DNA sequence: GCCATGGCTAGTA
DNA sequence: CTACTAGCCATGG
């Protein structure tokens, strides 16, 4: 399998998500049959124009937190998205937006 | 050829 | 609970 097909598969998947629930970079590389490519899933999302109707925000690291993404402050748009999604979000000791991971994982 | 990034994971201290 | 490991891997200079 080449890239770009890859990219799409992902995108389609991240639309397969149910409003409210979420998944995980790894939990998606694993799925589109490309287990190891978790890190590329981040990038895939990193790309994306702001004009999209794709559910970027509702996706996280296996830690069940908003990944750092060092270069950004959309970490907030991601937050202010799901407290909008009804998903309850709790800020954390020395920073961090975390939340009950397994209330919201996704299943066929 | 190289390394330096990256929205990563899964260990084990 | 945190911190710091291995490994993983495009992508671009």
UniProtKB/Swiss-Prot annotation:
GO BP, sorted A to Z:
global genome nucleotide-excision repair; transcription-coupled nucleotide-excision repair
List the residue(s) that the UniProt entry marks as the site Arg finger, required for nucleotide flipping. 39
Q: Where is this site: Critical for recognition of O(6)-alkylguanines, probes the electrostatic potential of the flipped base to distinguish between O(6)-alkylguanine and guanine?
A: 69
Q: Which residues form a coiled coil?
A: none
Q: What is any one of the record's Gene Ontology cellular component terms?
A: nucleus
Q: Annotated Gene Ontology MF terms?
A: catalytic activity; damaged DNA binding; O6-alkylguanine-DNA binding
Give a yes or no for keyword DNA repair in this entry.
yes
Keywords, alphabetical: DNA damage, DNA repair, DNA-binding
Name the residues annotated as site: Required for phosphate rotation/nucleotide flipping. Answer: 25
Supply the InterPro entries for this chain: ATL_DNA_repair, MethylDNA_cys_MeTrfase_DNA-bd, MethylDNA_cys_MeTrfase_DNAb, WH-like_DNA-bd_sf
Q: What is known about what this protein does?
A: Involved in DNA damage recognition. Binds DNA containing O(6)-methylguanine and larger O(6)-alkylguanine adducts. The DNA is bent, the damaged base is rotated out of the DNA duplex into a hydrophobic binding pocket (nucleotide flipping), with Arg-39 donating a hydrogen bond to the orphaned cytosine to stabilize the extrahelical DNA conformation. This structural change in DNA presents the lesion to the nucleotide excision repair (NER) pathway. The affinity for O(6)-alkylguanine adducts increases with the size of the alkyl group.
| PANTHER family, A to Z | 6-O-METHYLGUANINE DNA METHYLTRANSFERASE, ALKYLTRANSFERASE-LIKE PROTEIN 1
Which NCBIfam families does its entry note? Answer: ogt
- Would you identify the family this protein belongs to, as annotated? Belongs to the MGMT family. ATL subfamily.
Further information: Does not have alkyltransferase activity. A tryptophan residue replaces the cysteine at the known active site of MGMT.
The protein's name in its UniProt record: Alkyltransferase-like protein 1
Source organism of the structure: Schizosaccharomyces pombe (strain 972 / ATCC 24843) (Fission yeast)
Q: Gene encoding this chain? A: atl1
């Amino acid at each position: 399998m080449r890239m770009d097909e890859f990219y799409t598969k992902v995108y389609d998947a991240v639309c397969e998500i149910p409003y409210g629930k979420v998944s995980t970079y790894g939990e998606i590389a694993r799925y589109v049959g490309m287990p190891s490519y978790a890190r590329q899933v981040g990038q895939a999302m990193k790309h994306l124009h702001p004009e999209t109707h794709v559910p970027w925000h509702r996706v996280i690291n296996s830690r069940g937190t908003i990944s750092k993404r060092d270069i950004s402050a959309g970490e907030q748009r991601q937050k202010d998205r799901l407290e909008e999604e009804g998903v309850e979000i709790y800020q954390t000791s020395l920073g961090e937006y975390k939340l009950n991971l397994p209330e919201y994982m996704w299943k066929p």
